[PDB]
Amino acid sequence: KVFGRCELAAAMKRHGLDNYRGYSLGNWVCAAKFESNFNTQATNRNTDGSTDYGILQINSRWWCNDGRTPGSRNLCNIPCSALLSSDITASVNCAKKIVSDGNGMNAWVAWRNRCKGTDVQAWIRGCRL
């Protein structure tokens, strides 16, 4: 399903990503605008066959499970199927993980090569925050 800048912001906020392990809310909604266009049924097929599903485009070989993935390390112990579902709880939990695993958002093409520092706030303004 398709949220909106503001719904999202609302649901991102009330799940904990609202300023988590130092990385602003704007960062999440922004990452979302560029890697999935706010649609949870957003498939993005990587080369290796693995895939990106969800609002936050989690990859299959390293964080979830979808079978067809020559060696999925699945660090969230979550089936890719839950991301796909209009719910965002599943990705808001694996994303609290993903990032937090030392690394940083620094696995998102978009977050990384797009929303990395445009004075953060912005994507959460206008809305009611």
Swiss-Prot record:
Residues where substrate binds: D101
GO biological process, one term: killing of cells of another organism
Disulfide topology: C6-C127, C30-C115, C64-C80, C76-C94
Recorded catalytic activity of this chain's protein: Hydrolysis of (1->4)-beta-linkages between N-acetylmuramic acid and N-acetyl-D-glucosamine residues in a peptidoglycan and between N-acetyl-D-glucosamine residues in chitodextrins
CDD domains per the UniProt record, alphabetical: LYZ_C
Subunit field text: Monomer.
Role summary: Lysozymes have primarily a bacteriolytic function; those in tissues and body fluids are associated with the monocyte-macrophage system and enhance the activity of immunoagents. Has bacteriolytic activity against M.luteus.
Protein name per the record: Lysozyme C
Species assigned in the record: Gallus gallus
